[PDB]
Amino acid sequence: ELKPSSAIQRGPLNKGGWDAPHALHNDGAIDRYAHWRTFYQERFKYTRATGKSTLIFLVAFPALIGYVAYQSEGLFEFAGKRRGESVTTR
């Protein structure tokens, strides 16, 4: 006995416009390939290869750049120069 009112006359929704003809034949193999590649993260897992890449590019490589950047900080002063003069500071 609880129904939305008899005074609605609600209809269908169109988006409106022109049916453009198909300029592309979709390939099922390429479509499911790309749908597998974009949503790759929902099925990614940790293996030995994944862990090796994550150990290098997230941990070891920022640490190597950190060693190089914080050690060689105010060494070089190549502004003028001469012969026999100090090229570094430390």
Partner 1 sequence: EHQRPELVSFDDINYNDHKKVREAQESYTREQFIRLEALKTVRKALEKCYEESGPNHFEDCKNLAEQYLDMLPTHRLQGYLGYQRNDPSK
Ligand X SMILES: CCCCCCCCCCC(CCCCCCCCCC)(CO[C@H]1O[C@@H](CO)[C@H](O[C@@H]2O[C@@H](CO)[C@H](O)[C@@H](O)[C@@H]2O)[C@@H](O)[C@@H]1O)CO[C@H]1O[C@@H](CO)[C@H](O[C@@H]2O[C@@H](CO)[C@H](O)[C@@H](O)[C@@H]2O)[C@@H](O)[C@H]1O
Q: Which is nearer to partner 1, 39 or 78 (CB)?
A: 78
User: How many whole angstroms separate alpha carbon 45 and alpha carbon 25?
Assistant: 34
Residue of 34, 36, 55, 67 that binds ligand X (CB under 6 A): 55
Instruction: Tell whether residue 82 is a contact of partner 1 (CB under 8 A).
Output: yes
Q: Which stretch binds partner 1 (CB under 8 A): 2-10, 12-20, 30-38, 77-85?
A: 77-85
15-25: burial string, b at 16+ Cβ within 10 Å, e else: eeeeeeeeeee
How far apart, in Å, do the first and last CA atoms of the chain sit?
90
Instruction: Tell whether residue 43 is a contact of ligand X (CB under 6 A).
Output: no
Q: Binding residues for partner 1, per CB under 8 A?
A: 77, 79-82
